[PDB]
Ligand binder design. Structure first.
Ligand SMILES: [Co+3]
Ligand SMILES: [Co+3]
Ligand SMILES: [Co+3]
Ligand SMILES: [Co+3]
Lengths: 120, 217, 151, 151, 151, 217, 120, 217, 119, 152, 217, 120
């Protein structure tokens, strides 16, 4: 029967934290603060944390937040690959067709790993 | 008369301990830690920031470092010494300004900055808030009794990965010469979520219906 | 009394809202469009932007069992049985659309703590089923149930 | 486009929201409470204060047949076949809940214009059924149907 | 007790049968196909050939009010207020699909006896509304209600 | 207390009488007539026909004329002297044979030969019976405890206009020498609807659950 | 306000019965016992007593039962026109596509006014 | 291809004309009257009321008489010479102020001041507007991009009997020395329903989707 | 039966509806400023007094006109004519959950005299 | 014939309009879950014997190429030890939950569950699965063909 | 076009082969084995049992051993050499008699004796058959045209664990002196599931609709 | 990360079959053919193959069919424990309260592992 390593995450993260324990593991980021990026509509079978409401929308990267395995991998116990995560601001008008022009400036900010992002 | 959930909780907990996955002492330690938590540290962070421009800069740039100053070390405060498994170690502090006002949700579940803020409210976990705030935030905020000018940018922050957020509201009028303590007192849990703004004289969250539990903590 | 009648009426009306209601009974593959396939395979935690009604938001007091469940889930993660992302994916997605909205919040956390024990073979399903029987028997025999029920 | 697919998906998962669905099949009078008596005997048009969700509001272009139906209904009243209050009662209440919400707004006005001709005996139901038969034949034959279909 | 639990279960799961549930809220004419048009305009008494579940057929004792309603309807016909065909059309068809299956059999007969009085203007709706108030006040004032309630 | 239906019944009945549409005496007359009705005349018609071939020819050809011989004149027996308004004056009798077996429904409502048979059963009025019998009659009959050879023609009669039907079953084995009274005794209501067949020794309809009224006749 | 004649039906039917009171009023029947007829799918708006399950089926007339106004007219108070009514037997196989061949001979008999019938 | 609605409409119209219930003339004249209708006269009534305080008091007290000044006589403009059968002859003009802002609906159907305003919008007829405006008006208005201070009285008028309303909004800032034409231009249909306020430079209703007809007018 | 098709046009032409009913209601039972509660009269078959008003109290602001009640007109019964009143209700009085923040919001609608009683 | 087709289409349509009391469910508090409902929400979906249902016309269905390929994949994965059929049944017929269990096609569930075992036992990351689906859709779009489903 | 199911099927198959979970040869071999399967061996097993009482006793007691006589070895015919993973190695043959008639379902899914009978029918997999046969078997059988005397025991076999069944029906009248080939020809798939009985001159399942596939095998 | 043994089943079952590969592993059977047994309502969370419609019913053992792990074990990869399986015949009337008295002899047969059985 398989054996699950119950000490691995505590060994790696104790006194460092998560996602600090992944820092440096993603290498060079593909994007920079201020880049405009469109969210790719990648297959979402079984798990994703990139909300459907964002797919195909364009936004601006405002921060490179941390490096981490993507949740699509961490939630199935796969943490060998690490990527950059970005905080992206979208105009609410670009998400919801009905949004009022009177509320011209309203935005939504959320986090997306690099795999979902293409240059706009 | 125990419910099905009470039966299955006891079963799960006894099995986990029997199989050496965690101990009864572990479980007591965690519940003891959770009982420590609450919104005061986060209110203190905002008061300190309103009084010290350099510390407000640190809050906006590095919320994890800033949290240390109010005794919440996101790595070493929790019993794991690696941050709590569910809230991680990347606090960000969102600074409101006269042209920007934030409010926070987790549309995917209920992610919330427990280490610095304490328990998430019931309604924050509700599918209803999780559906509506992202798409009609002015409508939802008006239900909580908050309206802003139409030209003010309302930004909804959706906590869908490892970051957790607190809102640093603008300091309200009528607080000239106030001490850190008087300032922190008006920064309620709701102000830190962004569904309310601090007001002098108001020191508790707006009263709302409380649904009672069959058998309470 | 008249007003309570009015409000009960408005609640009841809603249950009679007409609809085209198509029960689905394992349709053939030719009945599933790409639109349907994407909807059936969605992860149900992804609710943002769905339309919903107004409600008076409430607070809720915590059940003893809910605090215990939360601590159990976090202690299982502290001690390396899972990570919280593994929990979220089992608890908020794998449970499927019906249980996702039919059962309560910490109901799902608790079912999913039982689930990890069985899926990673820390306990057999037989051990879980037997332990539930043991708990029900402890209760019926006047022997008490932890903090829930004294002996 | 991808965005069209996203909004189509949000509309589709609304069809799959979990519910407890109780079909009703001519219950005995012992299953009818006052609450349900009042709810089944409600006038369908009275919807103010019912819960509902936000929806995008749209404009709709007028159909030729809608303009023709509106003018028929008003000319019937001008010339004393009914008053508009009789029309509203037949159109918005007597049609019953299912048609009231299932059919289009001017669909109800048109059905009710046909209804007043039959209920006040200006036209037998046989004359109306026969006229529908003859109109369908006119369309099928290639001879045209007024402004809707040239020969 | 175990078997009763099993049967309550089999009843409960039926309520959770998944479906594609489309609430209808006055759709535009472009959303109504010929199929839908024929279905919404059907008369609802025409049930024969529709699929339905097994039931254990039962007899039912007659309520005093059911016997009185039946007599009222037959007497209204004997004395020329309507024919039974006029009654069937109003009672089994005009009531619309929702009331047709939501209310009881003799509920429909009784509502339609009231309807004929108003539709043929033997009484005004005001007189009917006023008489219902009278009946309720007779009851409340301990004055009794014919054979249903002694003083 | 009293129900909404009781309130509305009294209202309707009092208005009709006030407006001179029918009298209180008319209403009593009609209820008194209905209380007279029952299945015995129709059982008698079947026994008479089993014993007299000429009378069976008349039943099959002209049920209205036949019914007179058992005291039910469909024109003149009811208080109107024009047939009851809802059951009219065109009884037909359907003769079963070794190759034909009939069963009756009204899919549109609950039309039934009350003048010769008495009150329709609850289940006969049910949407369930009205939906299913026309299309799965062997399945529904089997639930009532009746099955026939597959080559026998089961004919369902749907009473959708002014005719009302009774079923004349075949005379069962084991009734040699029986008198009209003995034969009529085994022709129950269910036999006359066609959901059962007469059997020596069986003189009441199959027992089934009776749903009770809140306030009975 | 309109006045309703409450005596007309009792004057016509008393001592005669319904549908006897319409005998002779339909004139010559269009069909005869043993004719095969198909049921026309006439518009059914507001009222019909010719069940949808029969529309477009073919059956055999087994009886001319009586003359009467059609229910589509009688139910709206229109009794000036009277037509012949026919009892028609259908094979169950012609109504329900699933019906078993083992139950080869099963039938359904119901009444239809002349207006719905065409020669098969 | 012609729909069931088009077939039925021609059936009803040919039968009504054949039976003499209205004439072919009547139907053409009514459609020609409806084609003359639109939102221009109501906007002129508001601009004139803003320019003349005596005319504004006439509007608030007697909308029918005021309407004559913009060429809409609620009695004699329609072909009937007794007002339109469905919109009647009792216009009321609702005057907004700095503390009062009105919006109108017909919860029971779609009653709207056609003679002075023209065609009711599709969304005004929707069960969604009809349910929600009376109970959550600030939620609905905010979906249209209108919010007002929490202290301003929002008054929903439910047009449930024979009165029809138009809203006379407050005259906005930025219109010093404007002429009647300039003022009328900003008072759109939506301003006269109450879901929008007039704004300099905005001379059309807020864009929204237009669902197309299969055969449009 | 014969329907009179000329009655309405004869009475309303040159005058209008509800102007053609002016004076037929006699003296009004209530006055502007009065507080009135809405009676929950039976609503079988038809009403135009919305369920959401029943049992609420509001203020009369205008005596708008005289007309038959719609409960009568919609069934062809125009013999009785009554006064109609425009009522203002506080929103908090209609909807238990209405925000205290929006304290001043109201709803105005019209109700014929039969549904009104002094508060 | 065409009219009979319209008749049976009509009977099917009217069944969509049957009246019901329809209560949407939205994450209730634990105080609204009875034992009866707990047992009904935690039921294993496959266990349907004895549930009420209506007569339906039973039909045959031709096998799709993709259904035969799915069936063979699921049995080859068991032949070669990735799972046993019981593990497959439990994942396929129970853990999918009630909505998918009755909303999707029978071999739809077999195919989803074959993808599922590859991810749950870590033979393939979810990223590999998502990327393979991306690459397959590009194959179709490009004109290069997709096995026996689509010639180039 | 190509469907989502066809794209997923190629993705799962290519990934399994790339990861060495099964080989391309394994997949071709399995499909080749499935193509060999069908209802002929089971029908021959029944015909041989009717013709030889000792073989019939072997079928009833040990269906696995009996199956070898018709060329189906439940261990060694499938490619695994340990039976197919989903159908196992415990066939039972259920013998009908004049007082006992069996019919088979798998209420939990669709378990069926593929090695000796071939593909399960679409209807056999439907939630409808799976709900209804165990509880109303005589209703379901009558929909298939099969009815039996009320006294004959109908036994439904629910295939819920590792056993698979075939029904060995009674040999019908009208087959005196028939050969094994003649007998086998009347034992259809449907006779082996139990929803039909074998009849002389009927050598195909009862015709029913065939729903077509978008891309058929 | 865990490793799954993929050769275990094939090594044990090749040349032999399932459930033949488990023969002898259950030890002595607790019950015998002809025994009356009631079905215990064991918790069914996550998985069972003992249908709800059997729980609490009493039936007759007609055959000891084979030995195998319980499916509640096998479906989670746990094959250490092997138990006897019994074919049980139930009277239809004992399962379904509405079952017709006319059809008095009808039965249902299905298989149940030993853990669910108790002497009646
Ligand atoms: Co969350
Ligand atoms: Co009837
Ligand atoms: Co209106
Ligand atoms: Co199976």
């Amino acid at each position: 029967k398989p054996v699950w390593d119950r000490t691995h995450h505590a060994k790696m993260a104790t006194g460092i934290g998560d996602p600090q324990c992944f820092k440096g593991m993603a290498g060079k980021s593909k994007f920079n603060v201020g880049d405009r990026v469109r969210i790719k509509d990648l297959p979402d079978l079984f798990y994703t944390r990139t909300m459907t409401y964002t797919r195909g929308a364009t936004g601006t990267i405002v921060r490179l937040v941390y490096e981490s395995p993507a949740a699509e991998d961490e939630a199935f116990g796969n943490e060998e690959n690490v990527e950059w995560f970005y905080s992206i601001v979208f105009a609410q008008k670009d998400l919801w067709p009905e949004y009022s022009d009177t509320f011209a400036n309203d935005t939504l900010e959320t986090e997306i790993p690099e795999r979902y992002l293409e240059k706009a | 008369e125990v419910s099905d959930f009470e039966i299955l909780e006891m079963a799960v907990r006894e099995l986990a301990i029997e199989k050496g996955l965690f101990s009864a002492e572990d479980h007591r330690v965690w519940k003891d830690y959770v009982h420590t938590l609450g919104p005061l540290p986060a209110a203190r962070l905002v008061a300190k920031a309103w009084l010290d421009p350099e510390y407000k800069k640190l809050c906006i740039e590095d919320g994890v470092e800033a949290s240390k100053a109010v005794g919440v070390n996101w790595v070493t405060s929790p019993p794991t010494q690696f941050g709590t498994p569910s809230d991680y170690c990347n606090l960000r502090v969102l600074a409101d300004s006269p042209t920007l006002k934030h409010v926070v949700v987790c549309t995917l579940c209920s992610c919330y900055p427990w280490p610095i803020l304490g328990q998430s409210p019931e309604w924050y976990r509700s599918p209803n808030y999780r559906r509506r705030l992202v798409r009609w935030p002015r409508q939802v905020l008006a239900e909580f009794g908050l309206q802003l000018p139409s030209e003010v940018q309302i930004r909804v922050a959706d906590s869908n990965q490892k970051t957790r957020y607190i809102v640093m509201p603008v300091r309200p009028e009528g607080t000239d010469g106030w001490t850190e303590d008087q300032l922190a007192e008006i920064v309620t849990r709701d102000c830190l979520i962004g569904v309310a703004v601090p007001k002098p004289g108001i020191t508790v969250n707006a009263k709302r219906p409380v649904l009672k539990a069959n058998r309470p903590v | 009394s008249i007003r309570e009648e009015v409000h009960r009426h408005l609640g009841t009306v809603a249950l009679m809202q007409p609809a085209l209601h198509q029960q689905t009974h394992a349709p053939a593959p030719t009945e599933i469009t790409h639109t349907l396939f994407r909807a059936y395979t969605r992860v149900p935690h992804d609710v943002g932007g769905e339309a919903d009604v107004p409600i008076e938001y409430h607070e809720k007091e915590e059940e003893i069992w809910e605090l215990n469940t939360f601590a159990t889930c976090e202690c299982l993660a502290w001690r390396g049985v899972w990570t919280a992302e593994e929990r979220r994916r089992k608890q908020n997605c794998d449970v499927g659309q019906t249980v996702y909205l039919g059962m309560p919040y910490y109901g799902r956390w608790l079912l999913t703590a039982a689930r990890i024990l069985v899926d990673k073979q820390f306990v057999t399903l037989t051990e879980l089923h037997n332990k539930i029987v043991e708990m029900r028997e402890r209760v019926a025999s006047g022997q008490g149930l932890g903090e829930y029920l004294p002996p």
